[PDB]
Design a protein around this ligand. Sequence first.
Ligand SMILES: Cc1cc2nc3c(=O)[nH]c(=O)nc-3n(C[C@H](O)[C@H](O)[C@H](O)COP(=O)(O)O)c2cc1C
Ligand SMILES: Cc1cccc(NS(=O)(=O)c2nnc(NC(=O)c3ccc4ccccc4c3)s2)c1
Ligand code: SF4
Length: 363
Amino acid sequence: MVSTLKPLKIGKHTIKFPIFQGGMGVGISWDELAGNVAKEGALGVISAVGTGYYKNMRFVERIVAKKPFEALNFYSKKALNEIFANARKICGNNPLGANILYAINDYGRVLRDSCEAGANIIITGAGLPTNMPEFAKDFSDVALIPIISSAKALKILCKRWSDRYKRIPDAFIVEGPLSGGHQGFKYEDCFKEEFRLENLVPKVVEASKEWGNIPIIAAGGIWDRKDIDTMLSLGASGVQMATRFLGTKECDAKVYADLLPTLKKEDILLIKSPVGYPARAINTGVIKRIEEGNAPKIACVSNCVAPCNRGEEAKKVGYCIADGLGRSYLGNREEGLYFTGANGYRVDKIISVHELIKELTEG
Ligand SMILES: Cc1cc2nc3c(=O)[nH]c(=O)nc-3n(C[C@H](O)[C@H](O)[C@H](O)COP(=O)(O)O)c2cc1C
Ligand SMILES: Cc1cccc(NS(=O)(=O)c2nnc(NC(=O)c3ccc4ccccc4c3)s2)c1
Ligand code: SF4
């Protein structure tokens, strides 16, 4: 209960602790996880990606081959609505974020869906989101946070936003190459010291000065309070952590509770992705299937991302990301796709969200 960490303002919202739990798709950070995180005083973040899979396609208008049909059902507005409502059953009006990748043509639709669902903050990476306020203008209080890989991206985003909307972002998340999910770096760049998070945060904070010290949130490889204090000392206003929350009981993708305590370092790797960024995965499930020559059939049903071009890149790399992540949420251990930060092998026990926050904030 006693902490020396100080409350964090993001636009018009305040969170008790300067910690975000990073969004994780598909079905990893939904209502149980995000709700309990926000209940603890950190920022819970609901993933808006693949919400059609929620409760085994409870809220989709059409299913093909046990997949949500097209982007309208993959990014399901009614599913998102119920996920926010069920999270707020836990955390009340405590601030909640909605994480939405940029690499989708229906980006504005999902952004407005998140706003109408009750999100206080929109977080967007997997691209350079130069037009978030275009879609958020009916919702003045919703704070807008790009995820960036470099100080150059901060400067570009601030200039484009300022010139077009007379608004600049409410915060920036800089994500490094030790993160879960997709990386904002070429594979070769993920191993280079120049892109380590401790080197990115100083540059991004210095770039932020020019625009009035927009708060910076460091993400990628942050494990414990020592890492948090390191990032804060480098100028970051907060941290975003995901892998630690991937190992909590309240994770909405229950498979991880059985997968992580067995996870060995040598079974984490960077792979290719239809999204067009390296993805950090566990060497299990669909990956193993592909290497056996038992790859699931690929035929684009959910149309989840623009860079794939309705199956072109999925067929090239060998897997459909929507299919695999949805299968993981539904408990398919043989054909699921499973993601992790570099630190995933350090998960020994599955603990509660409350005990994790107590660890991260005590003192
Ligand atoms: C399993 C998993 C799935 C993720 N999926 C997404 C995602 O869909 N969208 C996103 O912006 N970030 C995603 N991330 C990245 C996290 O939000 C976060 O920025 C990063 O994992 C933090 O690093 P850490 O895991 O070392 O704390 C994912 C991370 C993990 C571990
Ligand atoms: C600027 C820049 C570039 C790259 C990464 C970052 N870093 S990041 O925005 O924090 C992210 N890390 N992982 C992410 N994963 C996803 O978008 C994702 C996860 C699951 C999907 C499933 C189906 C379809 C699309 C899907 C997309 S996004 C920042
Ligand atoms: S084939 Fe490509 S665009 Fe279609 S659902 Fe799979 S990854 Fe997404």
